[PDB]
């Protein structure tokens, strides 16, 4: 019936003065834009159909044409920034916001989806959607006693659109908008649907990726314990955003890192640092490096949870990026830790993999490993055990690598290796 229409026939039907003909043509356009192929979005735009679809969005007496046009415009807005721009320039944002209050659930869902695509284009269209007043009706759609009474796909689409309203930086979302949305996000974070939980954790990760004031806004809602709980989840789509959010949070103040620790996050890191997914492993090692950059009591908390052996493990065997995050974590540990903690670190066997990692090509990892070794040698100097550390670094064939690095192209590596070999290996 409405399958495989030509854009010319679609235009013919839309330009008729027969609302039923227009509805048939609009459904034909929707189906044309719904194929698994890359839809013919450019052809639809060139025909000048966006304004007609936007007008059909306002026909409350013909809910089916509202639904078909909303679906078509959603698909159009799902494409390049230019096609989303074409949708927005047709005046579709206020029409979709008005349709958010439709009595029909599928029309409201399509409006939510379209607004989500528009906002996901970027921070400019996100802020424009917010300025047209979408947050209020969006959050009203979720003002129910129990989220379980909502359709699964409906709630998933609402959560995804809200996450896109929290997304993107330069600029970050308006502070008042973030504060208006956060409570609903916490509510959703206590939901049971894995996809809702994943999208909510991604929204929280977006909000926590910024200066310490954004982190503070997020942390004051008390979501850190729930984030740790989800960090212990089995489904990777949940663990990934939860770990990203925890990492963001620990990039802030020592008090925010302390909130992360008090929630019991470290107890989950034994598995995270041994996770089969290298991405989880790298994100966890980066979170650990940010934690070891904190206060001495926080380093001691890391020690008490038995995580130093896991840091040694990831330093010994892991993909190069994870090993680099581990080197950073060790350097922060040694720079901020007591000589007692550094001695413990050495006793766990850090020296051998730290040496092994000095044959790397990256000059940054080389210089950070040299900084770590320098901190370790200072700690040993305060103990009079510097000859012990020399014999340690020479037993595993490590001093050879420092001697080789003496001739590195980087001036900093050159000088650090020369200083180490001149003072501790002469």
């Amino acid at each position: 019936g409405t399958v495989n229409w030509s854009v010319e026939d679609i235009v013919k039907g839309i330009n008729s003065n027969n609302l039923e003909s227009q509805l048939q043509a609009t459904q034909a356009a929707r189906k044309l834009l719904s194929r698994e192929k890359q839809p013919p979005i450019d052809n639809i735009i060139r025909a000048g159909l966006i304004p007609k679809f936007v007008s059909f969005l306002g026909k409350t007496d013909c809910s089916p044409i509202q639904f078909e046009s909303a679906w078509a415009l959603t698909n159009i807005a799902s494409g390049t920034s230019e096609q989303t721009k074409a949708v927005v320039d047709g005046g579709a944002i206020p029409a979709f916001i008005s349709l958010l209050a439709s009595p029909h659930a599928h029309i409201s869902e399509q409006a939510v989806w379209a607004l989500g695509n528009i906002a996901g284009d970027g921070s400019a269209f996100r802020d424009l959607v917010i300025k047209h007043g979408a947050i209020d009706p969006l959050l009203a759609l979720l003002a129910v006693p129990d989220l379980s009474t909502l359709a699964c796909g409906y709630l998933r689409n609402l959560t995804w659109t809200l996450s896109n309203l929290c997304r993107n930086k330069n600029p970050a979302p308006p502070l008042d908008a973030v504060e208006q949305i956060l409570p609903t996000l916490v509510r959703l974070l206590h939901h049971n649907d894995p996809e809702v939980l994943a999208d909510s954790c991604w929204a929280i990760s977006y909000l926590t990726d910024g200066p310490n004031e954004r982190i503070e806004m997020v942390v004051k809602k008390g979501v850190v314990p729930q984030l740790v709980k989800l960090l212990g989840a089995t489904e990777l789509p949940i663990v990934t955003p939860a770990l990203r959010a925890i990492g963001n949070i620990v990039t802030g103040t020592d008090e925010q890192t302390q909130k992360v620790i008090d929630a019991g996050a470290l107890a989950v890191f034994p598995s995270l640092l041994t996770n089969p997914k290298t991405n989880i492993q790298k994100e966890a090692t980066w979170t650990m490096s940010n934690i070891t950059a904190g206060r001495q009591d926080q380093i001691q908390q890391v020690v008490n949870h038995g995580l130093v052996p896991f840091l040694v493990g990831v330093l010994s065997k892991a993909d190069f990026k994870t090993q680099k995050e581990a080197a950073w974590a060790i350097t922060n540990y040694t720079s901020g830790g007591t000589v007692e903690q550094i001695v413990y670190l050495v006793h766990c066997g850090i020296i051998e993999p730290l040496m092994n990692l000095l044959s790397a090509k990256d000059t940054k990892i080389i210089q950070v490993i040299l900084d770590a070794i320098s901190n370790i040698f200072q700690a040993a100097e305060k103990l009079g055990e510097t000859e012990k550390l020399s014999i340690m670094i020479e037993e595993c064939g490590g001093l050879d690598k420092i001697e080789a690095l003496q001739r590195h192209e980087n001036e900093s590596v050159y000088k650090a290796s020369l200083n180490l070999i001149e003072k501790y290996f002469s």
């Binding site: 719904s34 698994e36 839809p39 679906w71 959603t74 698909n75 807005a77 799902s78 494409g79 989303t84 399509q110 989806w113 989500g116 695509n117 996901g120 284009d121 995804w160 996450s163 896109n164 997304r167 994943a198 999208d199 991604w202 990726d209 789509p237 990934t240 955003p241 990492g247 620990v250 990039t251 802030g252 980066w286 490096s289 940010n290 950059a293 904190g294 950073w328 922060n332 720079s335 901020g336």
Partner: peptide
């Protein structure tokens, strides 16, 4: 000393 650093689809096409 603390160093810094998107899986969900930014846009989704409705297939059905």
């Amino acid at each position: 000393k603390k160093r810094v650093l998107q899986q969900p689809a930014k846009k989704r096409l409705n297939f059905g």
